[PDB]
């Protein structure tokens, strides 16, 4: 089956391992270039193209 | 020789959201490429 | 307009064949 069926809509648990993701990306570049905070990471995701499109507008 | 039933058979699924996504993809690809097909 | 003579059939088939594939696979789901 598709991996997307491993997520249930409304489930309380997290569907991925943020520590594994951070342990991958902080070895891809280096440790402190990687977000260990999901809120900080999601803010950065929101902020970067919004600020760029504000500037070009 | 015998015609034995194959156990490796699996059902295929396409849910309704995937159908809507596929129909939208097909329609917008037609929108995009129709002018070039007509040239 | 002097368009390609195969443009209409190419456009209709290019839309219709994958539309048919998706409709076939969707309607049979749950079997």
């Amino acid at each position: 089956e598709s991996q997307n069926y491993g997520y249930k809509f409304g489930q309380e648990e997290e569907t991925y391992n943020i520590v594994a993701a951070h342990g991958y990306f902080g070895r891809l570049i280096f440790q402190y270039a990687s977000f260990n905070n999901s809120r900080s990471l999601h803010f950065f995701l929101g902020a970067w193209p919004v600020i760029g499109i504000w500037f070009t507008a | 020789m015998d015609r034995n039933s194959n156990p490796n058979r699996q059902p295929v699924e396409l849910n309704r959201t995937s159908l809507y996504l596929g129909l939208l993809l097909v329609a917008v690809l037609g929108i995009l490429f129709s002018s070039y097909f007509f040239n | 307009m002097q368009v390609n003579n195969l443009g209409f059939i190419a456009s209709i088939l290019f839309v219709l064949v994958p539309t048919v594939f998706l409709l076939i696979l969707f309607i049979q789901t749950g079997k």
Binding site: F9 | Y20, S34, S35 | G7
Partner: peptide
């Protein structure tokens, strides 16, 4: 008559938008 084909593909896209909104798979908590 290429206008007929253009109107058809645009109408198909808009109809898919209508059916994807009004008759979506409803999200359910289970």
């Amino acid at each position: 008559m290429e206008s007929v084909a253009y109107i058809l593909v645009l109408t198909m896209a808009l109809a898919v938008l209508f059916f994807a909104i009004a008759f979506r798979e409803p999200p359910r908590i289970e």
